[PDB]
């Protein structure tokens, strides 16, 4: 994991979007390719469409997912069995 002395990593373009939405109260999803951004407490209550390689999967941020990377909720491989 990222060192604690550096703090959590969030992309600036995504952070500005969530900050604008929270300053306002827009409910439309925020579309992003930033799978590597960490979910912050401010993220709670928002819908983020995370790119998974080919599509944008919507994720509704609940309190329990604070501290996860955004990409953990958008799987990138397809598998159903053999």
């Amino acid at each position: 994991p990222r060192s604690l002395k550096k703090g959590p990593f969030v992309d600036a373009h995504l952070f500005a979007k969530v900050e604008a939405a929270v300053a306002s109260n827009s409910r439309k999803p925020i579309k992003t390719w930033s799978r590597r951004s960490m979910i912050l407490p401010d993220f709670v209550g928002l819908t983020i469409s995370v790119h998974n390689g080919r599509n944008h999967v919507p994720v509704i941020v609940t309190e329990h997912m604070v501290g996860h990377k955004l990409g953990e909720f958008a799987p990138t491989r397809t598998y159903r069995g053999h």
């Binding site: 550096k6 703090g7 990593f9 600036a12």
Partner: protein, 100 residues
């Protein structure tokens, strides 16, 4: 290698050289202990806001003659094929077949 890949490598070296000084300055400001926490946070933000190609970790050593990205041998600056050719021709000073 392809001309596009060689030109990509050249452009990356150019960007690293262009942004070398400011990156070092921001890293020093981050490492500063006498600096304010807000100052170090702003330095980190600017470092993350720098262009990606400014980072030296994205450079890949390529053969100075052909551009091959495997088997580089930092000391000679040539990949293994051209190194073998040049050594066996005798244009590399001091290098001889090794036996012991």
């Amino acid at each position: 290698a392809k001309k596009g890949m060689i030109n990509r490598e050249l452009k990356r070296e150019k960007t690293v050289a262009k942004y070398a000084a400011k990156r070092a300055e921001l890293k020093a400001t981050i490492a500063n202990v006498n600096a304010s926490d807000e100052e170090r946070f702003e330095a980190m933000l600017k470092l993350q806001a720098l262009p990606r190609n400014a980072s030296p970790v994205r450079l890949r050593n390529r053969c100075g003659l052909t551009g091959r990205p495997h088997g580089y041998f930092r000391k000679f600056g040539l990949s293994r094929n051209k190194l073998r050719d040049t050594v066996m021709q005798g244009d590399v000073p001091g290098v001889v077949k090794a036996s012991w």
